[PDB]
Paper text:
Amidases, also known as N-acetylmuramyl-l-alanine hydrolases, break the bond between the L-Ala and NAM, separating the peptide stem from the linear glycan chain. Gene analysis of M. tuberculosis revealed the presence of four amidase homologues: Ami1 (Rv3717), Ami2/CwlM (Rv3915), Ami3 (Rv3811), and Ami4 (Rv3594).12 However, the functions of Ami3 and Ami4 remain unknown. Furthermore, Ami1 is specifically required in M. tuberculosis during chronic mouse infection, as its amidase activity contributes to the pathogens ability to persist within the host.
In this work, we obtained the 3-D structure of the Ami1-5 complex at atomic resolution (1.45 Å). Compound 5 was localized within the catalytic groove, positioned at 4.3 Å from residue His125, which is part of the coordination triad responsible for binding Zn2+, along with residues His35 and Glu70 in the active site. Finally, the iodine atom engages in an alkyl interaction with residue Arg109. Interestingly, a network of water-mediated interactions stabilizes the tetrazole ring of compound 5. These water molecules are positioned in the catalytic site, between the hydrophobic core and the coordination zinc triad. This suggests that the presence of compound 5 in the cavity may hinder substrate binding, and, consequently, inhibit the hydrolysis reaction.
Residue numbers in the entry: 26 to 237
The structure:
């Protein structure tokens, strides 16, 4: 059956080791982990992605889809971005989805789906682009606005994210909204909003899996 790797972005807790350089997959290095952002009230990105990721896991499991998580808690150091990608590749999953939230200007809001471009392998060139497009349509269908300050119509093909560069299986990274925006943060800070994000995410994952 289907297997999905879920990466709730960032760590449950950080230490100085997050500054260690790790490969990007395109030659250079970047920091092992970014700390992540937060809403104005202090709700951290790492907890938003963890709590939303658990709802996504529950939804996929309800469909009979086996899941794996990149980290097992929201209160301790987790793996660096290169390790998370190597872990995902070792599982050989049918899809990989990373969950993040952005820290942008307060008036900008909405989601963007990131994918590796230019592609480094045939999966990145084809299936992952299709996965990104399906996911963008699904978030829009849940009434999550496409970001009005970054990407293009809810999509962002890019070369600078190590986890996307290193993937050998279909992989996307979803920035679900801007934590600094009043409307997005109200969604993120509510259990009902996190469930609505997870509903969009599961429909995007299932839609992509059903085409493969
Ligand atoms: I570990 C990952 C997995 C899937 C998609 C993207 C990523 C990522 N890229 N940069 N940080 N995280
Ligand atoms: Zn992030």
């Amino acid at each position: 059956g289907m297997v999905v790797f879920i990466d709730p972005g960032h760590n449950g807790a950080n230490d100085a080791s997050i500054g260690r350089q790790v490969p990007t997959g395109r030659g250079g290095t970047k920091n092992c982990q970014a700390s992540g952002t937060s809403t104005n009230s202090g709700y951290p990105e790492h907890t938003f992605t963890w709590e939303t990721g658990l709802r996504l896991r529950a939804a996929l499991n309800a469909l009979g889809v086996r899941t794996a998580l990149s980290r097992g808690n929201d209160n301790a150091l987790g793996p660096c971005v290169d390790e998370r990608a190597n872990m995902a590749n070792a599982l050989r999953p049918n899809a990989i989805v990373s969950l993040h939230a952005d820290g942008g200007p307060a008036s900008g809001r909405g989601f963007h789906v990131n994918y590796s471009a230019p592609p480094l392998n045939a999966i990145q060139a084809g299936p992952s682009v299709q996965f990104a497009r399906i996911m963008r349509d699904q978030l829009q269908a849940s009434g999550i606005p496409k970001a009005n300050y970054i990407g293009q119509d809810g999509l962002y093909g890019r070369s600078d994210l190590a986890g996307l560069n290193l993937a050998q299986y279909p992989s996307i990274l979803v920035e679900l909204g801007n934590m600094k925006n009043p409307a997005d943060s109200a969604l993120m800070e509510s259990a009902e909003g996190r469930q609505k994000y997870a509903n969009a995410l599961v429909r995007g994952v299932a839609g992509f899996l059903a085409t493969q």
